[PDB]
Structures are given as C-alpha cells and as structure tokens.
Write an enzyme that holds these catalytic residues in place. Structure first.
Site, PDB file in Angstrom:
ATOM      1  N   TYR C  26     -19.075  30.401  38.695  1.00  0.00           N
ATOM      2  CA  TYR C  26     -18.132  29.234  38.669  1.00  0.00           C
ATOM      3  C   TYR C  26     -17.044  29.657  38.989  1.00  0.00           C
ATOM      4  CZ  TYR C  26     -17.094  31.169  33.946  1.00  0.00           C
ATOM      5  OH  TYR C  26     -16.384  32.044  33.212  1.00  0.00           O
ATOM      6  N   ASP C  37     -10.158  30.089  34.646  1.00  0.00           N
ATOM      7  CA  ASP C  37     -11.246  31.028  34.775  1.00  0.00           C
ATOM      8  C   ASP C  37     -11.953  31.164  36.101  1.00  0.00           C
ATOM      9  OD1 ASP C  37     -13.070  32.815  33.726  1.00  0.00           O
ATOM     10  OD2 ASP C  37     -14.036  31.183  32.389  1.00  0.00           O
ATOM     11  N   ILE C  56     -20.466  24.495  26.826  1.00  0.00           N
ATOM     12  CA  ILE C  56     -20.355  23.317  26.236  1.00  0.00           C
ATOM     13  C   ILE C  56     -21.108  22.217  27.055  1.00  0.00           C
ATOM     14  CG2 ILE C  56     -17.771  23.440  25.622  1.00  0.00           C
ATOM     15  CD1 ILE C  56     -17.027  22.906  28.507  1.00  0.00           C
ATOM     16  N   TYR C  82     -14.448  20.963  25.231  1.00  0.00           N
ATOM     17  CA  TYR C  82     -13.920  21.290  23.776  1.00  0.00           C
ATOM     18  C   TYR C  82     -13.042  20.239  22.808  1.00  0.00           C
ATOM     19  CZ  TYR C  82     -15.086  25.963  25.694  1.00  0.00           C
ATOM     20  OH  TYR C  82     -15.295  27.242  26.140  1.00  0.00           O
ATOM     21  N   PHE C  99     -14.827  22.171  37.603  1.00  0.00           N
ATOM     22  CA  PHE C  99     -15.486  23.363  37.686  1.00  0.00           C
ATOM     23  C   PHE C  99     -15.952  23.258  39.313  1.00  0.00           C
ATOM     24  CE2 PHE C  99     -15.842  25.495  33.530  1.00  0.00           C
ATOM     25  CZ  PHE C  99     -15.349  24.557  33.104  1.00  0.00           C
TER      26      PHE C  99
END
Lengths: 820, 375, 107, 384
Positions: C26, C37, C56, C82, C99
């Site tokens: 990812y 990230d 999630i 979140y 993402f």
C-alpha cells in the site's frame, strides 16, 4: 528544497536541528507509542538515507543518527543495559563447556587471552519487544490504562550492523587519507554519531562473532590478531570521540568480566559434583568405621552432623597450606582448585615489550598515553577514562563487587525466571517516568506475575540479590511525594504494592532482616500512611519486625517516641478524611490510634512472650503522654473506661451518631465500634507489655514497679464490668430470620479476649471467692450463649465461631491455670 | 535438627554451587593479596612524550595523576546540597592513600632512608595539589559521617605520616587565604556525631549471643555481623589521629589557628569542643565500669569493648598533648578554663578501681596493661 | 463509504476471499497531499488476515473489492476510517484517506 | 512587632540592625558600655521605640523624638552616657562575645521575650514577641554578629529600591482610571529616568557570571547570585515587579498608555516593559524556590504571550522557570500547550519555541507522558 541547501541556509539548519531535538524529546524514555507515531513523520527509508548521505551538515547528521537511536533502540537498550548488571547462570551443557581460556598450548600457566565479546554467553538476557510499525491497522476499541503498552518499532538490525561496519571502515580509511573535507565538516561530526550507533548495537548484542572480530580489527588490528591499516586509536581524535571510544572499550571490559563469571560458574559446576561424590564416598567409608574405631569419631562425623555451609568452609579451608590436616580432601582434587586459582589470577593479570598484545594492558597504555599527551578538558570524559583505568589493573575487585549479584539456577526454571526478569524490567523502567494511570495496572499485573512465579518463593537469595524490594520502596516514596500533603494519588497501587512488601517480609527472615534497616525510612512515610486503608507502610513495618526475637531487640528508641507522638496527634484532633465524609465530630481518631496500638503490639510481643526491654520503654514513653489513651483514663475530666464502652456500644447501635447518616461501601466507619476497638487494642498492648511472672517472683524492682503502675492505672472493677457486658445473640424468629449482628458494627469476643489476657498477665487471680465472682457475672452468660448457639443453625455464624476462638484463647487457659 | 538432617550430597546442585561460590569468594578472593598501587601512581605521576614537543611556553600541562587531582578538586568544589557517592572516588582515594606509607636492631644510618622514601612518596603528591583534596572534601562533606569522610580522612593521615611540615604549611596557607567557616563547622559536627558506649545497646547485644541465631542456608557459628556499640571507633580514632598529625612537630601558629581564626568571621574553638567530646566519653566509660563493678569477672565482649574504647581514649590524649605542646599558652588557658578537670577526676576514679579489679585474676592482664599505658 | 479506481488492473478473476490472507504494497497519504505511510519504504509487503478486522473498514472492504495483481486508488471517508478520533499523532480526527494499493499477492 | 525568630530569617536581611550614635562627630568610634545611641532597621526605615499605644514597636523614621528610641549597653542588670571620645574609642564590646544587656536610656526598661505562649507557638515555629520589660529575665542575653559588606549593601538596596517603585505604582493607579484625554496627567510626574537607571543597575547587579571565569570563582559568584536573588524575593521584590508588569499590562499600546499617563511617558513604555522582563528573568534564573513560586500563577504569564511589545523577555522567563522546576511542569494543561503552538503560528519559525517544548517534555530526567502525548496530539498530525 534539498536539505543540502541548509548547509548555506543556517537559520533553517538551526531551526530544523532544534526540531529534531524535540523529536528525540517527545519519544524519549520509553514512550514507544509516540515513537510509533513519529515513524509516520520520519520513515525507515528516510532514516537509512540520512545515515548514508555523506553531504549532510554536522548537527543535522548527528541529530538524525541520535533520532534513529531514540526511535528504535533506547527503550530496549536501557532495559538490556540494566540487565547486564545481573548474572544468572543456568546449569546447561554449554555453560559446562565454558572455559576461562580458549583451547591452546602457548602457556601452561595461562594461554593467550581470548577475544573479548566473542564466544558463548549464557547469562539470562530477556529478549527485546519489536513491533513492526503498522498504521493502517484499526485503532483498538479497548480503553486506556488497560491496553498493552506499545513495543519498540522494528527495523532490520542484521543489515543495519553491516551498514555500520561499512561506514566505520570507510571513516577509518578516510582518517588514513587525512582529507581536508571530513563528512559533516568536522572529525567529531564524522565519528561521534557512528560510534554512538555502534555502541548501542553492541549493547543490544546484534553483532556476531566475526562482526566483533572486525570491530576489534578497526579498533586496533595488530593487537587483535589471532593464531591505512592502522587502528582508530592513533588518529589523534577530539575529546567527544574519545568519550565514545571509552564507551566502546568499557563494553568489552564488561564482556571480559561476564566471561570470568561464567568460567567460575562452570568450574563450580564441575567441582561441586566431584566434592559431592567424594563426600558420599567418605560417608560410606565412615559407616563401617565404628568397627575399628571409638568415640574419637566425633570430629569425623561433625561434618555430617553439621549443615553444608561450614562443611564446604572447612573443605575449602586449605588455601594458606597451614591447615591441610583439617581438610580431608585428596590432594589431586585440592590441586584442581589450586590450578584454577592460578590461571584465574593470570587471566586477571596478577602474576605468572612495546607491543601490549592484549586488551588488558592495551587500554591502560592507551589511557595513560592520552593523559600524558594532552590536558583533557571534558569532566565526564575524565570520569570515563579513569573509571576504565581503575578497572584494568584491578582484575579482582570488580569480580568481588559482581559476585553478590551473581547466581546459579536450575535449567528447569529458566522460563520461570524469564517472566520475572521481564516484569523486573517493566518496574525498573517505571523509575524514570511520572506515575500514571496507564502505568499502574501494568505494574500491578507485573507484581501479580511475581506472586504467581514459583522461583519468587524458591530462591529468596536471588530475589534479595535482584533487590526489587528497595526499588518498589522508592516508587512508593515518589508516589506519596506526589501529593505528599493533599491526597495519596493512585491509592490502589500503593496498597497493592505494600501487600507485596508484606508478603516479601513473610518469605524469609533474611528478607525481613534486610528490610529491617528501612523501618525509620518507612516510618516518616507512615505519617501519611494513616490515610490509606488496607495494606499500609505501618503493616509493612509490622511484618518487618514480627516473629523474630533478634528483631525489635536492636530496634532503636528514636522510632518509639515518634510513634507515640503520632498517637498523641491521633488523640488530640479529629480524623480529617473520616470527618470529611459527613461523620459527627469526635476529637480523636480511633482507627489511626488502633493502627499504632496493634503496631506496638507486634513490636513488643513476639513468639508468645513479651520483650521486657522494649516493654518498659514503650510503657514509659506512652505513660509520659497520657493524652492518647482516649476520653477515659485521663485523670481530671476522665470518665470511667467501662462507661466509655457503654457510650461506644449504645452510640454504635443508635444510627446518625455512629455513621454519616446517609457495609454499603465495604469500608464504612463505625465510630462506636472503632472507639472500643481502640480501647481493646490499648489494653491488649498493656497486657502484652506486662512483666513476666518469673521476673515477678524474682522480685526485680522495675518489673514489680511497672505492674504496680498498671494496677494503679486500670481498676479491675471496670474490667469485670466489661466482662459482665452482654453480647448481642443471633435470635430465631420472623419466619426463621436470624438477626445476625455484623462484626463491623457490633462488639466482638476478641476484644473481650484482649481484656482477659490483660487481667491474666497484670492483675491475675489469687482467691477463690473473687475467682467465682468474676466467673459467674460475665463468663457464664457468654459460655451459655456459646453452648446455646452450638446447634445446627447458629454454630456456623461468625458470632459463634468468634466465641469459640475467644473461649479457647483466653477463657479456658486462664481457668486451667486457676484450677486448684 | 542436626541429628535429623541430610548430608551435603543430597542438596540440589544449583543451591550447592551458590553456597560454594559464596564460601569461595570469602575464603580465597577476599583473602587474596595483590599490590599494584605503587605502579599505579608511578605511571600516573610520570609524564611522557612531552620531550618530543619540547615546549618552552611554561604552560605546565598536568601529569596524568595531576589531572585526577584537578578533576576531584572540581567535583569537590562544585556547589551541591549533598555530596553524592562516587565509588571511583572510593577506589582512587584508597589507592592514593595506602600507596604512601608502605610499612632486629635497625640503626640510624638505614632508618633514615625509609623516612626520606616516605617523604618522597608524599612529595610526589602534595606538590600536585593532593593536599587540597582533604580540605575541600572535609569542607564539602557538610558534617555527616560517611564513606567519603572516612576515605578522605585515611588519605589525610597517609599524606601526613611523620608530620610533613611542608604539607602542614600548605594546609595553613590554604585556610588563611580562603577564610571559610564550613571546614571547622563540618569538623565540629562530625566529631559531635561520634558515638560513645551505650549500656542499653550493650545489654541488647548481650541477649543476642544467648540466642546464637544462625542462618538457614547452612550454619554460621556466632556470626560477625555489624556491632552496634563503638562501630565508628576507627573513624573517631582516625579523626583524632589526623588532628594530631596536623599539629605534630609543635606547629605553634597552626595550633593557635585551631584555637582561633582571625581570618574567619565565625570562630569555633575546636579545642573546647574536643574537651567536650572527651567529657561525653567519660560518662560512657564510667557507667561501663558502673555496670561491671558488681560483677566479679568481665566477659570477652566487654573486654573487647574496653580495648576499643581505650584505644580511642589513648588517641584523644595523644592529640590533646599535641595541641598544648610547644608550649601553646593560648591552648593551655583554654584547657584550664574548660571542663577538662571533670573528665580528669572521672578517669582517675575509674582508674582507681580498674587495676584493683583486674589484679584479682590473671585473665585480665592484657586489658590491664593497655589500660596502664592509657593512664 | 469506500471508492475504488483502478490504476493498473491485474487478474480480475481470483478475488480475495475468506480463509486466505492478503499481501499488499500500500501507500497511504492524507487528502492534503501529505504522505503518511507506505510499505515500499519499509521494503516489506504488508500482509493482513482479511475478515478478522485488524485494519479499518474502508481499507478492508476496498482490499476485498479488487483482484490479484491489481493497483487501485482507494478513497475512505472518516466513517469507514478512524474518524472522530483519527490516528493519534499521525492522522487528525475526521479526515478522508486515500490509498494507492497494489495487491501484489494472495497468501 | 519585634520577635525572636529563628531559621533562615536569622540569615535574612530583616535580622539586621544598624546603630546610629547621637554624636555627629566620631560616630564610628569603638563602643563604650552605655553610650546613648539609636537603632534603625535596614530595609524599612523604622526606629525601635517605646511607643505610647503598643509599647515596644518600630515607629517610622519621621517620628523618632530621640527619647523613646535611644538605648544603652551594660554588662549587668544593675542600675549603672559618658564624655564622648574624639578618636578610635576604647574597644570593649566584641562580636559574638562580651555579652551585654540593653536598657532603654529614658524609660529604664530592659528588652525580654514575652513569656506567654499562644497556640501559634504551641507546636509550630517559634517567633517570640519581645517586650521591653521593666527588669527582665536572666536568659535574655544577646549575641552580636557581623554583617558582610554585600549583606549590608543588599539591605540598603531593598530599602532604597522598593520605595521608588512603590511611588511609581501609586503614580500608575493614580491614572489607571480617569483618561487624560487632551489635558494634563493625574498627578506628579513619574521618575521615568530614575526608574530606568535603577532598572539598568539592578540588571547589572543580577548579571550571571561570565563563562570564561574559573570554576572556583564561577561557583562562588553563583552562590552570591542565588543568595541575592533569594533575599530580594524574601523582601518581596518579586511581588512588586509582578505589580509593575500587571499595572502596565492594562494598556495594549503606547497610545493607550498615552491616553492616561501622557505623551512623555508613552515612548518609554516599550523600554520599561522590556527592562522589567529582563530583570524578572535575572531574578528567577536558576532559582529553585523562586521558580517554584511561579507554579501558582502559570496562567498569568501564559495570558501575555499574545502581546507583541515584549515576547522574547517573557519567553526567556518561561524558559528559566521550565528548566528549573518540574512541579511547574505538573501544572501544564491542554490550553497552555495550544497557546505555545500559537506562538509558532503567530511569530514564525522561532527555535526558542521548540526549546520551550523540549523543556516541556522532560524535566530532571523524568518523563511526563501526559505532556508528551499532548505535544504529539496537538502538533504532529496536522503537519503544517
């Protein structure tokens, strides 16, 4: 913009360096949750590239290297570093195979010294906790202070150590180039962050045997050969690099120390087995010795009728060679110990040329050469280099100061010790952090794991050597210091840990004797210990003094008057937190006074007999301050003690005066019960302070004088009135509803046993008419009550069982003695 | 239980090894002797490779020992509420101290060479600021008994053996040009914290050997754990030995300095204080006779207690001789005006019944002969 | 509340089902253009046991939508993310997540 | 009211008494037992006297009529002024020795402690009221001890220094209300130049020792610096300067100061508030107790970060408190940290703010996880 521009953009460089310092600040001291959070902002790739970039400026390069250590290494490093000071040696075959010297033939007295940090180390070192940083994972639904603490963000260390070796190799040969453009712009910026990283990885023990061999080659090649290429030590480094060089050397000195300790453990394993077999052989031969011998067998069988400590003492009592005759060991076996004593000192460089040829006199030569070559300026550098210098020549003193922390365990309990050491690391890690709700539950479950651990009871010596008890006593000192006056923050951990201390004292007397020193230190903290309910420092002190006659015999007097000054404070003013709950006002604190009374009861009464020396000083200082006896017995303005008891009983039975008028919370205060509980502990205290009968018939002055004072103190008429005082009985009625009085709010038979013990030890019974006069009025209704309750429905009640214990503890022995 | 317990070979191996290592360290390694402090300080005190540079500025870089001296001076003179414990300072101070003294009709020809060798060893140190270590450490210890004041005191005795006049001169000059009161304040507090004989503690000790309690891990016969009566005898004796040494050789002006300090704003008459401590000692020794006068025989622990008490008392009298010799008229006036007479009459009354009690039997000839040299 | 836009479609046949774990590289990034990230930076493919709620909602259902060898653009609302608490110290509360996910392998 | 008070107060300036003989010439002569002489306190300008309403008190210096104030020294209590010596004088009274009893020259009463003990002295610290008794007790002997020159100079500092700003403060609240408008100010002209000169002298008087100084003199100067700082706080200069900043803080700008104080004082407003911050930092820098005194009013300094007149001075004050007292760190709350972040958002990339945050994280090597979590919660995820 490229960060390489910041080499000219100074203001950005300073601001960003201070930013990196803040990054190393927020994640400092085990805050792994913030460390994992910071892993998003600065990535693994970012850190690795910043390590390998040779054009970065100085402070930024050092900041990034230090930041990498802070993010990934420090949490595990600190705990592992702390565990390096203890040496638990399992009984394993590789431990057996550990030898002081590697297999060689160069010297019979001593071979060539082995390579430091290379070999097998069997010291029990807990594994690290590394969690791969995953951010896309769902946030836990668990609440705070219950979820497990975050572990260290993982990072490849097997490749990282290879990178470190390559970097330092390049730096070493660049030093040989003596280039006018050092990486980072200065020598210290080119070397200090790299050496710090190698230092930390060395502490973690990431490096293999060959990796350590290479590190020794780059430190000093020619000295470290086993059978510009010049070591770092001849490159005239700055002082900061010298400081990190000292940090590099001290680790190898520690590794040598641990190697010696393991060598001793291995020889101890072999020698104990040989001595066990020899002593078995001698015992078997001594069995048939009675045929050709006589009564001179006493000192031969003294070994087998004496416990092993002095057995091994006399067996090892052959060092000076003037005491061989006492030792029954064969000479070859004694020679084994003598030879192993020879090579150990030779290894420590005691007794058995420009090339030192070994680390032992290499580092000492290095340190003295630096000191004579220039005036060192850095203080902690001077501290480090001279600590090393002291450590080199002294080959034995460090071993002497390391043996008390050394210990050997059975291989079957290594996994048992694993959990204990991990929880030990957790509580040790909590010494550097302000106490928090998150930390309380993890350390309470840690000490719970200590309770569950079998080795915690099996090896008290190892527990004492680890010394968790003192560390826990500091963590109480800090938690009470925080809110030392206002309130005891985190009360649950305070009582849960003082519970552990009470168990710790009960494990063994040596633990108790060790704890005996801190009583006064515990005593100042016990001033605010009245606030907390349950297990308190006063209870810890009582468990630290009780069931030992030797203890409380060396108990210093200065504790006593401070305890009774606390009793005076209990008696002169109302209890603050008790009164804050809406209770009616009374000018004294029965519960805190009771606490000191039963504490002094444990202080002066041991193993069923009174200590006369403690007894006279406590009664003298107590009677010097009559203000703490209560509303009665004060003299002027003091009503009868018996009358005050009926005041307490009827006020206890009548609501709105015994309580707050609102157990419901399992700790409800009952003023009427507490007052008479205080009175009962007051009289049980005096009864257990009473002089012994053998001294009384001996006619000694003070022994007679104290008891005569107690008779003038307490009139026996009030005592027989308390004896005649009734007990509420479980009654049958209303569809069989047993009206059962609650011990928390009713008069208990153990109070009456306290008064019976008092009158037995102080007043006594001399004549038959008054003997029956005291029996019929109060003992008869209670014993009839117990006989009546001795049935199917009433025997199981607390009132009946308490009467059973009361009669068999205080009544029946008294009249057994008064039987003629 | 000894008639009913199990022999050695049935004990677990790990426990047995723990007992063995504990016995081994006490019986072999503590007993082991090794002297290295001479080649410690020879290497530290010698400076090398300055010949190659051959620098003529006169900058006078410190030799490796002198760097140590400066470092300990810096941590001595830094301002801190508590003098935090330094185990390396324990190591270095003990190494520094006992490396100096290093000590059948010996004649005056060869008697002197060991003396000038001792002077040489002291001269190796006091020329390098080592003399200031004791003054700074005693000033900074703030008057609490501890490891540092003991190790420093032993160092002071070590460098002051034989009454080194030049060392005393350096002491006097440093006190004069610094004019600080904390030194004598610390000295007065430290000596006031010295212990005397206690009857209650002694009787409580006496009850212990009646029990004769041993350890569970084997057995130790009447263990030699720390005695609670006269534990600080070596420290008190060393303190007065040091006070004796710093006035040995009739250092008159130094004695007058001890009696009074014009430079210091606050003056502490330690001579009067010394008499006050001797006074405090006289009740303890008198009452210790006033526990044994009835008893016909004195037991062994009481004999040892007398020996350690009178060793300190002998040191006190030797010191008190030193302050007044020369003669120092100011000291002689202070002694006469102080309470010395009460201690004198008390000691004489003690000595009155000492020899009479001890002469009845041949078992107290030792304690009598040491007592005889005490008077 | 999750949306998929294919970037380089792969198999289209072997969709990730229950009983098998998913291995993905990812690349997470905030809607403000700020990356937070990745997995390629760590040089390790992130594997997650699908159906066991470790990640999630939006990421889980999005990862279930594409197939083997497929690179997709995943948009997740705070409802499937979140949300009201965010990720402490990493993602602010009530933010939308994007993402770039390349489902390189299954098991 | 005069007391026999113990502890550090006996090492404080309030325990100092200066004797002023009635003789104009040779007033510094050696003291002979029994000459008349006055007693004055160093820091209050008060004279000990037998007042009419409360007996022995320290009356102000404007009402010393030389009768109730003068006293005399004799060795004994017996019923004993000579011809004054025009020279050195016979040295008789010694410091710490040569005990003397002081009696009122006109009233004949001897000072002695008040015998009754109240509930304040029942268990607490003993401050013992002194009563000029007619004859007195036996154990009322008084030791006489020197003051060091720095102590004497410092004691004169508080007495001269405090009155100037007390007048300045009364001039400030004189025009706190009643705006000047376009007319004249409230009352007397405030000594702007005299105050500024005193401020500059005090800042230099509280200058920390230079780095190049050797370790021995550096530590000695540090001890003197801490002693002077402690004494000035013990005399309340910290409260007085707190009144100075608070009184000047009601005006946002120099124009606001002009509308009440006047045009001539408007320009000096920036200079004085900068000087007050500088001296405040010099007062508190490195002081354990003085830094701990700011744990009560943490929000007071936090309230003024938004001001633009002097941000560096107050930030330095905050930094000095932060690097000294961890108990102040325990008072930090979530509004404060967001305010610190607002400094960064409103004042640019000032690395001193980062240094403040760094001090906010760890104090005395003790981790504060609550604050570290607040820093990463309120600062990191935004990335702005």
């Amino acid at each position: 913009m490229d960060i390489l521009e910041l080499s000219e953009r100074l203001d950005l460089q300073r601001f960003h360096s201070h930013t990196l310092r803040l990054y190393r600040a927020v994640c400092a001291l085990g805050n792994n949750r913030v460390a994992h959070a910071l892993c998003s902002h600065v990535d693994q790739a970012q850190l690795l590239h910043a390590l390998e970039d040779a054009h970065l400026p100085g402070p930024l390069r050092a900041g990034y290297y230090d930041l990498l250590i802070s993010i990934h290494l420090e949490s595990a490093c600190r705990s592992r570093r702390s565990m390096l000071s203890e040496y638990i040696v399992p009984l394993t075959p590789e431990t057996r195979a550990i030898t002081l010297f590697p297999p060689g033939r160069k010297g019979g007295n001593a071979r060539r010294h082995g390579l430091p940090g290379v070999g097998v180390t069997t010291s029990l070192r807990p594994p690290h906790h590394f969690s791969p940083p995953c951010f896309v994972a769902a946030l836990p639904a668990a609440g705070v202070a219950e979820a497990p603490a975050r572990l260290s963000p993982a990072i490849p260390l097997e490749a990282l150590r290879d990178k470190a070796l390559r970097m330092l190799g390049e730096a070493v040969r660049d030093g040989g180039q003596h280039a006018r453009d050092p990486v980072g712009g200065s020598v210290e910026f080119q070397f200090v962050p790299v050496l710090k990283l190698v230092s930390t990885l060395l502490v973690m023990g990431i490096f293999g045997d060959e990796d350590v061999k290479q590190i020794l080659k780059m430190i000093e090649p020619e000295v470290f050969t086993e059978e510009l290429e010049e070591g770092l030590l001849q490159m005239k480094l700055p002082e900061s690099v010298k400081l990190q060089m000292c940090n590099l050397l001290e680790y190898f000195c520690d590794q040598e120390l641990q190697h010696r300790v393991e060598s001793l453990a291995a020889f101890a394993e072999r020698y104990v087995d040989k001595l066990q077999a020899n002593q078995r052989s001698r015992y078997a031969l001594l069995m048939r010795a009675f045929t050709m011998s006589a009564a001179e067998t006493a000192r031969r069988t003294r070994e087998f009728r004496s416990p092993p400590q002095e057995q091994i003492n006399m067996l090892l009592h052959f060092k000076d060679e003037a005491d061989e005759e006492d030792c029954p060991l064969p000479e070859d076996i004694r020679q084994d110990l003598q030879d192993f004593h020879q090579d150990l000192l030779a290894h420590c460089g005691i007794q058995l040329e420009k090339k030192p040829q070994s680390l032992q006199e290499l580092v000492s030569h290095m340190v003295v050469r630096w000191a004579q070559e220039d005036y060192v300026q850095s203080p902690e550098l001077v501290r480090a280099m001279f600590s090393l210098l002291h450590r080199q020549y002294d080959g034995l003193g460090e071993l002497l100061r390391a043996l008390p922390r050394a210990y050997t365990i059975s291989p079957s309990s290594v996994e048992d010790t694993m959990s204990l050491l991990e929880c030990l690391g957790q509580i040790r890690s909590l010494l550097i952090v302000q106490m928090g709700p998150q930390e309380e539950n993890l350390m309470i479950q840690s000490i719970g794991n200590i309770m569950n651990n079998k080795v915690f009871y099996q090896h008290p010596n190892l527990m004492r050597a680890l010394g968790m008890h003192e560390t826990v006593m500091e963590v109480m000192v800090n938690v009470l210091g925080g809110g030392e006056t206002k309130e005891i923050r985190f009360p649950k951990m305070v009582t849960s840990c003082c519970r552990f201390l009470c168990y710790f004292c009960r494990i063994s007397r040596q633990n108790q004797r060790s704890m005996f020193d801190h009583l006064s230190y515990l005593l100042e903290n016990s001033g605010i210990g009245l606030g907390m309910q349950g297990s308190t420092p006063l209870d810890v002190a009582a468990a630290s003094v009780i069931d030992n006659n030797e203890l409380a015999l060396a108990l210093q007097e200065q504790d006593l008057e401070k305890v009774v000054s606390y009793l005076a404070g209990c008696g002169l003013q109302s209890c603050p937190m008790l009164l804050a709950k809406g209770y009616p006002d009374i000018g004294w604190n029965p519960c805190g006074g009771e606490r000191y009374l039963d504490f002094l009861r444990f202080a002066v009464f041991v193993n069923g007999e009174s200590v006369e020396e403690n007894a006279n000083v406590v009664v003298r200082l107590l009677i010097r301050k009559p203000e703490c006896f209560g509303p009665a017995l004060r003299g002027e303005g003091g009503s009868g003690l018996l009358a005050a008891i009926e005041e307490a009983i009827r006020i206890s039975e009548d609501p709105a005066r015994d309580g707050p008028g609102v157990p419901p919370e399992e700790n409800r205060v009952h003023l009427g019960h507490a007052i008479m509980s205080f009175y009962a502990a007051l009289i049980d205290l005096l009864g257990r302070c009473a002089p012994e009968m053998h001294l009384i018939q001996a006619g000694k002055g003070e022994a007679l004088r104290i008891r005569a004072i107690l008779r003038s103190l307490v009139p026996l008429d009030d005592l027989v009135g308390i004896i005649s005082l009734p007990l509420q009985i479980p009654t049958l009625g209303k569809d069989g509803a047993l009206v059962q009085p609650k011990m928390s709010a009713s008069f208990v038979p153990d109070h009456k046993a306290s008064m019976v013990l008092f009158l037995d030890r102080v007043y006594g019974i001399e004549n038959q008419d008054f003997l029956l006069h005291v029996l019929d009025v109060g003992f008869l209704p209670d014993m009839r009550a117990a006989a009546s309750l001795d049935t199917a429905t009433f025997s199981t009640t607390e009132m009946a069982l308490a009467l059973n214990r009361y009669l068999c503890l205080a009544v029946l022995p008294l009249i057994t003695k008064c039987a003629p | 239980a000894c008639f009913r317990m199990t022999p050695l070979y049935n004990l677990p191996t790990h426990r047995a090894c723990n007992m063995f290592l504990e016995s081994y360290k006490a019986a072999w390694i503590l007993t082991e002797d090794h002297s290295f402090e001479d080649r410690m300080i020879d290497d530290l005190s010698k400076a090398g490779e300055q010949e190659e540079e051959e620098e003529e500025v006169e900058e006078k870089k410190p030799d490796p020992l002198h760097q140590l001296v400066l470092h300990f001076s810096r941590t001595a003179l830094t301002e801190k509420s508590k003098l935090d414990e330094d185990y390396l300072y324990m190591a270095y101070a003990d190494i520094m101290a006992k490396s100096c003294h290093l000590e059948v009709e010996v004649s005056f020809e060869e008697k002197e060479m060991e003396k000038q060798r001792l002077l040489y060893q002291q001269s190796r140190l006091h020329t390098r600021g080592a003399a200031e270590m004791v003054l700074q450490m005693i000033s900074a210890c703030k008057g609490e008994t501890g490891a540092m004041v003991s190790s420093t005191l032993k160092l002071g005795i070590s460098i002051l053996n034989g009454g080194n006049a030049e060392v005393q001169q350096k002491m006097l000059d440093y006190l004069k040009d610094k004019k600080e009161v904390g030194f004598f304040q610390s000295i007065q507090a430290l000596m006031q914290t010295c212990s005397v004989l206690d009857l209650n503690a002694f009787e409580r000790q006496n009850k212990a050997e009646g029990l004769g309690m041993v350890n569970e891990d084997g057995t130790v016969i009447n263990r030699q754990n720390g005695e609670k009566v006269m534990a600080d005898d070596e420290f008190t004796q060393d303190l007065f030995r040091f006070l004796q040494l710093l006035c040995e050789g009739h250092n008159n002006d130094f004695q007058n300095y001890l009696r009074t300090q014009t430079g210091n704003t606050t003056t502490i008459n330690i001579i009067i204080c010394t008499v006050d401590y001797l006074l405090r000692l006289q009740e303890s020794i008198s009452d210790f006779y006033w526990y044994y006068s009835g008893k016909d025989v004195i037991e062994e622990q009481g004999k040892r207690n007398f020996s350690k008490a009178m060793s300190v008392a002998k040191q006190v009298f030797n010191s008190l001789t030193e302050y007044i010799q020369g003669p120092c008229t100011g000291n002689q006036q202070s002694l006469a005006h102080s309470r010395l007479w009460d201690a004198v009459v008390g000691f004489l009354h003690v000595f009155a019944h000492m020899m009479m009690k001890l002469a009845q039997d041949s078992s107290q000839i030792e304690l009598l002969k040491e007592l005889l040299d005490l008077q | 509340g999750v949306e998929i836009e294919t970037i380089s479609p792969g198999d289209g046949r072997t969709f990730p089902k229950k009983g098998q774990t998913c291995v993905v590289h990812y690349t997470g990034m905030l809607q403000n253009g700020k990356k937070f990230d990745s997995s390629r930076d760590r040089n390790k493919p992130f594997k997650f046991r699908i159906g066991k709620q470790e990640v999630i909602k939006g990421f889980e259902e999005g990862a279930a939508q594409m197939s083997l060898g497929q690179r997709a653009k995943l948009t997740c609302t705070p409802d499937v993310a979140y949300g009201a608490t965010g990720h402490p110290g990493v993602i602010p509360p009530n933010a939308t997540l994007i993402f770039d996910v390349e489902l390189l392998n299954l098991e | 009211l005069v007391y026999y008070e113990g502890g550090a107060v006996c090492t404080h300036a309030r325990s100092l008494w200066r004797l002023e003989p009635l003789r104009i010439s040779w007033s510094g002569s050696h003291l002979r037992w029994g000459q008349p002489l006055r007693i004055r306190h160093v820091t209050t300008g008060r004279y000990l006297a037998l007042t009419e309403d409360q007996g022995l008190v320290v009356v102000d210096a404007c009402k010393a009529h030389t009768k109730a104030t003068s006293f005399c020294f004799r060795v004994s209590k017996e019923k004993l002024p000579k011809r004054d010596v025009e020279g050195m004088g016979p040295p008789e009274i010694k410091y710490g020795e040569s005990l003397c009893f002081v009696q009122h020259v006109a009233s004949g009463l001897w000072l002695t402690y008040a015998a009754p003990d109240p509930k304040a002295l029942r268990l607490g610290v003993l401050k013992k009221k002194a009563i000029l008794h007619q004859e007195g007790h036996m154990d009322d002997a008084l030791f006489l001890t020197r003051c060091q020159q720095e102590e004497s100079q410092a004691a004169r500092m508080i007495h001269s220094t405090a009155g100037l700003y007390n007048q300045f403060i009364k001039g400030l609240d004189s025009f706190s209300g009643k705006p000047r408008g376009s007319g004249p100010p409230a009352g007397p002209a405030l000594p702007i130049e005299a105050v500024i000169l005193s401020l500059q002298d005090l800042i230099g008087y509280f200058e920390p020792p230079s780095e190049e100084l050797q370790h021995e003199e550096k530590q000695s100067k540090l001890r003197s610096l801490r002693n002077r700082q402690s004494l000035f706080q013990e005399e309340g200069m910290l409260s007085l300067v707190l009144n100075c900043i608070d009184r000047l803080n009601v005006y946002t700008t120099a124009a606001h100061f002009a509308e009440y104080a006047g045009e001539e004082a408007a320009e000096s407003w920036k200079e004085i508030v900068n000087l007050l911050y500088e001296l405040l930092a010099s007062l508190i820098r490195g002081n354990r107790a003085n830094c701990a005194l700011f744990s009560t009013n943490l929000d007071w300094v936090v309230s003024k970060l938004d001001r633009l007149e002097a941000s560096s001075g107050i930030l330095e004050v905050l930094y000095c408190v932060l690097i000294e007292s961890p108990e102040v760190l325990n008072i930090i709350q979530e509004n404060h940290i967001k305010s610190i972040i607002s400094l960064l958002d409103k004042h640019g990339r000032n690395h001193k703010v980062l240094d403040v945050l760094c001090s906010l994280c760890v104090c005395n090597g003790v981790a504060v996880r609550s604050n570290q979590d607040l820093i990463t919660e309120n600062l990191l995820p935004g990335r702005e």
